[PDB]
Amino acid sequence: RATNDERCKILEQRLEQGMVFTEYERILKKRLVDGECSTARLPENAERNRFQDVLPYDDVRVELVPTKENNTGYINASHIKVSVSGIEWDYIATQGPLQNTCQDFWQMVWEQGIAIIAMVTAEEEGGREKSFRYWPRLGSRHNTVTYGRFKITTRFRTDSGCYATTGLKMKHLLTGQERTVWHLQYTDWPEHGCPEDLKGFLSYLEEIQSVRRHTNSTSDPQSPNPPLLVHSSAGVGRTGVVILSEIMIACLEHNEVLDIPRVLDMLRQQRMMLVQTLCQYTFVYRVLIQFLKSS
Amino acid sequence: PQYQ
């Protein structure tokens, strides 16, 4: 406990001295070398990128089983892994799907064994679409949609104010198998800047943990788990906030010295631009500080 | 085109 309080004071003083600003600006936004993203840049894939300047690296892009319409099995999504005290935290960071990439998104969900989706954007912001509505609406008369080989059913939904929890069912039409998928949408991110309500975002992170609780069925606590799927509009800024926040809170578990810029450097090696603004980075500090205060 |  005193170890946590000391780490909390250290976090606060880094914020007080402005050192949080300095350390953020010296973290490179993209790989210095081997960051060509050549597959993402192919002309045939341009329609599959929401933003032409946010792309996955070739070595870590999520590869779909190729189809005739999608020869390279390309989707704008990156595998992210960071080990904390022997436990590998696995994530897939992807853009908000477009109308033409909903089939790819659900194929990705199926092939990667994904059971949890963390959507950290509203569907429209500022009069612009940020994510296609790739999952159906609630209501017995229209709660199903088919995207290629996948029929998706919205089964229930709860609204917790800063976020909503939707239960989905996904069916592989070729073979008939079904899987349940949880969809956790943070709806309170402001149009400009970063949220002032830390508690709401902390309760969202807590709900992600609660859904991991719902879906864990392996007796072995060291047994591997499918990655959490995290997406925003570009899949980098608010997406990085969720991933860095979860990893950093997990670092608080053991006696491992906290090194937030080190962890963010490793994340950016795996997907460019994660935690995309200065206020998002300071927000992570504030979340960790509020977390330690509530311990 | 560009995320900003």
Author numbering:
A (entry chain A): 877 to 1171
B (entry chain E): 528 to 531
Quote the passages of the study that discuss this structure, keeping the authors' original sentences.
PTPN21 belongs to the four-point-one, ezrin, radixin, moesin (FERM) domain–containing protein tyrosine phosphatases (PTP) and plays important roles in cytoskeleton-associated cellular processes like cell adhesion, motility, and cargo transport. Because of the presence of a WPE loop instead of a WPD loop in the phosphatase domain, it is often considered to lack phosphatase activity. However, many of PTPN21’s biological functions require its catalytic activity. Combined with biochemical analysis, we have found that PTPN21 PTP is weakly active and is autoinhibited by association with its FERM domain.
To further investigate the working mechanism of the phosphatase domain of PTPN21, we determined structures of PTPPTPN21 C1108S in complex with a phosphate ion as well as PTPPTPN21 C1108S in complex with a Src pY530 peptide. In the 2.0-Å PTPPTPN21 C1108S-Src pY530 peptide complex structure, the electron density of the phosphotyrosine residue and the catalytic water is clearly resolved. The catalytic water forms hydrogen bonds with the phenolic oxygen as well as Q1152 and Q1156. The WPE loop is in an open conformation despite the bound peptide. Alignment of the peptide-bound open PTPPTPN21 C1108S structure with phosphate-bound closed PTPPTPN21 structure showed that the phosphate ion and the phosphate group of the phosphotyrosine are in a nearly identical position, so is R1114, despite around 10-Å shift of the WPE loop. Furthermore, E1067 in the closed structure is within steric clash distance (1.9 Å) with the tyrosine moiety in the open structure, further indicating that the closed structure might represent a conformation after P─O bond cleavage. When a phosphotyrosine substrate is present, for catalysis to happen, E1067 would have to move to a certain position between the open and closed conformations currently observed. It is possible that the open conformation promoted C1155-C1070 disulfide bond formation which prevented the WPE loop from clamping down.
